[PDB]
């Protein structure tokens, strides 16, 4: 039913499932905006496919040819099925709009499924190629941040009663390499191109005259070519073509609204803001150097992933509340850190 | 069946599922009133869609055109399907009420699903954008309250046998920022606007003459335009239009009753009452300062979320019972706290 | 099938599911009588809806109009569907009993579902508004009782080898407030009113002549108004109306039997008997004062909830067996308590 | 539905399920490229089979023979079923394209399923024959790497405050044996051959005239051979043949794109690059000798499997970050290793 389709595709965790494995425990591995874009671009065409053939919206068979009254039920069924299979056969049918509109009307669900698959492909490539590496690197970075926070609080407590910036060096090294950012931009660009092509196709499909679904059909090949009792042609109409056009314009609207989001996603350096690591600069055990901005490198992408999935880090949360309290400046950062006692 | 739909949509945890993740363990992340509003506004139109096409209420096909007796079964089926697809084609049909009523009668389930999706969108945006931040902040606040309660009871026990207000400073800082409250008000306002538009549409749909479902249909395009055996027109009726109007007025009543709730929700500062933190003011380790009221800021929203999901805090429950006992004043707050022995 | 519906709605845990959350572990949060009343009042109309359209009891379509023999199958189907949709349209049909009986016959499942939803609403309001508070308070009370029992047995063992009545003070304070009892009485009263209205409706529906299901139908609007081959009217009958009346009288009987139960529930103070706390009065560490009776206050409701869900408390069970043994008076209460050794 | 098939076969973990057993905990046991190739080559033909007979794309029965009007419904059904079963019987039917096109049109789903099974066979043979051995060997290798890393860090810590290369000897021994690599190459080659044969078949099927689906059928064997009322022949058409050809060309495109991937897979030594063990050469406890390249031996395959599933090793990750930091050369490898403190 329509409501069942809605529950499956919008109100359920459709493509929102976290990786089912212990390797990525709590790691999104995909930005929220990218996940939203993929979920829409994939589950919208599927939802429209399901809707267009819902038991309520669908009168019945997808084509009716209006055989003569003399024709029996199965003769008329032969006519309808023959014309359905003959939309491909150009000789059989003669339609003013041509044969491409008939092809599109017959295979619209296939085309929507193709667009959905093509849009799901780049996210899958990301999740299967560049996701494990970033997951491992980010897990190491979070562990290093937790360890340095613990060491700093232990030092502060000892004072009240190595020291090498490994994480900073690793981030600096990531500043050079750009394979991950190149893959990310390539997959986003392919998604954008697929969306644009889908918009072109949907606009063309919705621009039809709405009468191209009605085509003339001739079961006059073979032994029936010179038969007399059979009329030379029939009036066939492809039902649900109006529904297809409505859903196609809906998908076109959604995709044109979505494309600016993908374009904004492509410009990762601009998105790289609100320095996540700036909060850690007040730790004595952490060097006061952010050095993450203004670069078409994997460092900006790692900064984005950190700003996305750093809320799970207790040390980061503690430092964030310390920073927020520092806005008033009533107290002192080391005193607040010592009082917090948030090692684990 | 009707009962199955009821069980799925009203008697089950439809959209009442808690976040399936360890990050939010026991945190609602959504006020009870907001959750009720979203659940109604989403699962009502879906329930009505399912009901309108239930196997019992539905006689059968959604349109019947009453072809002549001479017409065969599949000729009549062609007529019915053609008219169903031609509700869009204005030339084919001539109805007194126009063609918009026919469009609405055909696509009412789609319109209800659209309203449900549009009403579910703002809650989803909230849960995916502003929910993680408030979850982390509120978890930190609850942990700080538990820790300060433990410290105060330990101090009292030591007396019988830092001290910095970090949580108060954090709340004071939240008094300034307003991004969360702005997002909350924006999503509530969008929900209200969607509800009002849905009410307008449902009122218009229910105001129809009830005879607009009957339209005249002409299969007279193409080779059949000059055919003689076919009548110039047919009498088609869209079945289930009365059911659609009944369910639309039901939804209109529900939404007009719900809109005052959304308006009351918009005025968060008025809702900010029954100070949750007032109970903690009797703790020696906690400063006697509430400072949370009369502000279009995130502080009021945090106060609401606390008053919502603070019952899970054992220290808060203990302080609440101490406060309630203090109404008589027979005993002493520190003595009762020491006797409680409710560290964990 | 009928047996499947029975298993789902009477032999299964339909609305008998305990709260699926760790917050309420073993707490009913709903009295047994109230749960029975809600389960009946909700799952009876749903069961009757399912039964009335069971594949065995149902001959087929819900209306047959007996078109002339000259009419084709789909002409007759048009007639039947038109009349089904025209039960609303007063002009189309002319029935002796009127049009309200036809409306009721068509929408009886909707009306039963409406009554079920309206009866499920007050229980849901209770469980979502006043259940968390009573759950927290009752959990605290049980914990306090366990702690005082442990302290008393420890004192007895020490003798053989604070002391403040916090729980008693909390109960005394609950004696004043009445918001919970007011909500309980309001929800019970609304349930009773809904049940009475349902009884009125079912009595009216069952009082019909049983021939109102037969109505005269006229497909004579539009181009067919002046058509000659079509008869001026048809004889239509709404099938399953007898089944609807039978199930409606069954529901009426059940609801009239149930209403006295709801009225008895409304009088909570009378139900407040068999003092649960009287057993704890023999503990040296517990003050000898019950002070819970004869009040339209939340104290009586808390006493009811205690008498309901106190069997899970080992200390209460031990004290109850001590009390039962004290009926003979052969031994001594402190000696029996010491010998029991039931700390945990 | 189409969307359901898509969710099952592309958006779900179809053939992506990890081995359901504790023996292989986190071990892929199959390269990512090989898994992708198998998943495509298997779930594409299945998806196309499901699509070709979807309730929306399918008009109805797969063959209609257009019996005379005098023929009754079940006479026409006999004709259609007889011709469907007589596509095999060459005498019954006379088609210009022959009888092989009819066989293919009737059994296209069977042929796609056969290709899917044949392509799934080599992966299954691998997973059931050569997977346990490589799993055990690789688990031992990872355990040895973890142990040597722990020993080296312990030695470094002791300095700050056996020694036999068992793993290197085992890898060197693997350099000689080649049974695993021979099995891998054989299964890949069989997969490639199956893909090529499938491409040949699909090209032949798509190269048909598109009118071979129309064949002449004669129910003139037995008592009906000399019957007069029955026409000497009928015009039968195999519906869905156009859909079969479309999906066959789609599968052909996918397989021709995939075959280069399989050919690249066959050349494992070229794939053996980015020495995984080179990072471990900086450990004092590990001998400075990689000795893994330029060989048609199991050593290259083991190197590939290591580069695939070594990210799960904490010691390897630590050494990798040490290597990346060494690019700048600011610090010292032993000092960084000591500071890391990443034993477990
Ligand atoms: C994806 C979207 C593809 C849509 C665009 C396809 C480009 C077609 C260009 C060729 C057109 C062509 O040959 O001309 C028409 C015939 O088309 C044809 O006979 C070819 C029809 C094109 C194929 C449409 C079917 C798409 C199936 C998708 C399946 C995906 C499934 C994946 C799981 C003639 O007619 P006319 O009207 O152009 O001219 C008639 C008067 N000059
Ligand atoms: C959402 C609710 C939308 C309802 C309001 C739509 C505004 C329509 C304004 C244009 C009306 C128009 O062009 O005039 C009518 C034709 O309408 C048309 O032909 C356009 C019909 C409007 C589209 C209705 C279909 C809604 C589909 C929703 C799908 C959602 C799915 C999402 C998953 C003519 O006839 P007349 O009677 O106005 O005048 C006839 C005598 N002057
Ligand atoms: C709930 C139970 C509601 C039953 C009582 C409804 C009160 C009806 C009062 C108005 C009656 C009225 O206007 O008069 C009749 C027409 O009724 C009408 O045309 C109005 C019919 C009333 C609506 C019945 C449909 C209930 C649908 C419930 C849907 C719930 C779904 C929720 C998920 C005329 O005929 P006559 O025989 O009275 O007089 C004919 C000779 N004077
Ligand atoms: C796998 C793909 C197999 C396709 C290629 C099969 C090779 C056929 C070679 C023999 C052809 C033959 O005997 O000649 C035709 C008859 O074919 C026949 O009667 C034999 C038809 C071949 C069998 C096709 C059915 C495949 C079933 C697959 C089932 C798999 C299920 C596994 C779970 C005559 O006609 P003509 O047109 O060639 O010449 C007619 C004018 N000279
Ligand atoms: C997804 C991508 C590939 C879709 C590409 C656009 C498709 C949908 C449409 C939009 C405009 C279309 C073209 C418009 C006009 C003509 C001229 C005609 O004589 C042959 C077909 C041809 C050349 C059409 C082919 C298909 C076409 C290119
Ligand atoms: C992503 C955005 C830009 C998509 C917007 C849809 C655009 C591309 C659509 C809307 C209307 C469409 C046109 C409608 C009609 C025709 C006439 C036909 O003979 C050739 C294609 C052509 C010229 C279409 C090309 C694509 C088109 C311009
Ligand atoms: C969800 C929102 C967009 C719904 C908006 C209201 C819809 C349901 C209805 C209510 C009143 C309607 C209008 C009433 C009168 C007319 C005048 C007519 O000559 C053209 C259509 C037009 C202009 C209608 C368009 C659709 C309309 C605006
Ligand atoms: C949220 C609340 C205010 C909704 C209440 C429903 C209101 C808006 C409904 C009920 C009846 C409706 C009217 C019924 C009939 C017509 C005549 C038509 O030619 C234009 C629209 C118009 C004038 C409708 C406008 C909207 C309307 C006034
Ligand atoms: C659930 C509640 C609202 C049900 C209320 C009772 C319903 C079922 C029935 C019982 C008696 C009925 C009334 C009996 C007699 C008449 C007089 C007639 O000229 C108009 C309808 C009217 C006024 C009926 C309206 C519906 C009615 C009130
Ligand atoms: C909860 C208990 C009291 C319910 C018992 C059912 C009662 C209320 C039912 C049973 C028979 C019913 C009556 C049957 C027939 C008529 C005649 C009609 O023109 C008006 C309503 C009226 C007068 C009904 C009113 C309600 C009624 C009296
Ligand atoms: C999967 C593998 C086995 C498929 C092999 C190719 C199949 C699909 C096709 C492609 C070309 C075909 C051949 C083309 C021409 C002829 C000559 C004819 O007089 C007899 C059949 C015969 C000999 C065909 C047999 C089947 C054939 C070999
Ligand atoms: C893996 C790649 C190379 C597959 C490409 C498909 C090739 C092999 C296909 C496409 C068109 C096909 C040809 C189409 C028509 C005929 C005529 C027939 O009487 C014999 C087979 C023959 C000659 C086919 C042989 C196979 C063929 C050449
Ligand atoms: C049909 O009859 C015509 C008469 O002109 C002839 O040309 C044609 O070949 C016949 N077709 C068949 C299939 O026998
Ligand atoms: C139908 O016949 C009329 C006669 O006036 C003619 O004008 C029209 O073009 C014909 N239509 C078709 C589709 O042949
Ligand atoms: C039907 O014919 C009658 C004859 O009196 C006429 O008044 C009426 O308008 C006609 N109806 C239609 C719908 O043409
Ligand atoms: C049909 O009749 C013919 C007449 O020539 C005869 O040869 C043939 O054997 C008969 N067939 C059967 C099955 O009786």
Largest sheet of chain A: 4 strands, antiparallel
Give the strand order of the largest sheet of chain A, numbering strands 1, 2, ... along the chain: 1-4-3-2
Give me the strand/helix succession of chain A.
Answer: HHEHEHHHHEEHHHHH
The percentage helix of chain A is 55-70%
Derived structural class of chain A: mainly alpha
Write out the distinct hetero groups bound to the structure: phosphatidylethanolamine, cholesterol, 2-acetamido-2-deoxy-beta-D-glucopyranose
End-to-end separation of chain A in angstroms reads 49 Å
Strand content of chain A: under 5%
Catalytic activity (chains A, B, C, D): chloride(in) = chloride(out); iodide(out) = iodide(in); ATP(in) = ATP(out); K(+)(in) = K(+)(out)
Cytoplasmic side (chains A, B, C, D): 1-39, 127-188, 259-344
Modified residues (Phosphotyrosine) (chains A, B, C, D): 170
InterPro entries (chains A, B, C, D): Innexin, Pannexin
General description of the model:
This is part of a larger assembly, with four copies of chain A (344 residues). Chain A is mainly alpha-helical and 344 residues long. The first copy, chain A, has helices at 2-9, 32-52, 73-86, 100-129, 131-160, 166-176, 179-206, 241-266, 268-271, 298-309, 314-326, 333-340; strands at residues 63-64, 93-94, 214-217, 234-238. In chain A, helix 2 runs antiparallel to helix 4, helix 2 (32-52) packs antiparallel against helix 8 (241-266) and helix 7 crosses helix 10 (298-309). The first copy, chain A, is elongated, with a radius of gyration of 30 Å. Chains A and B meet through helix 1, helix 2, helix 3, strand 4 and helix 8 of A and helix 2, helix 3, helix 4, helix 5 and helix 6 of B. Bound molecules: phosphatidylethanolamine (4 copies), cholesterol (CLR) (8 copies) and 2-acetamido-2-deoxy-beta-D-glucopyranose (4 copies). One cholesterol (CLR) is lined by residues 196, 199-200, 203-204, 207, 256 of chain D. Chains A, B, C, D: GO terms for molecular function: actin filament binding; ATP transmembrane transporter activity; calcium channel activity; gap junction channel activity; identical protein binding; leak channel activity; monoatomic anion channel activity; protease binding. Chains A, B, C, D: Homoheptameric. Chains A, B, C, D: The modification Phosphotyrosine is found at residue 170.
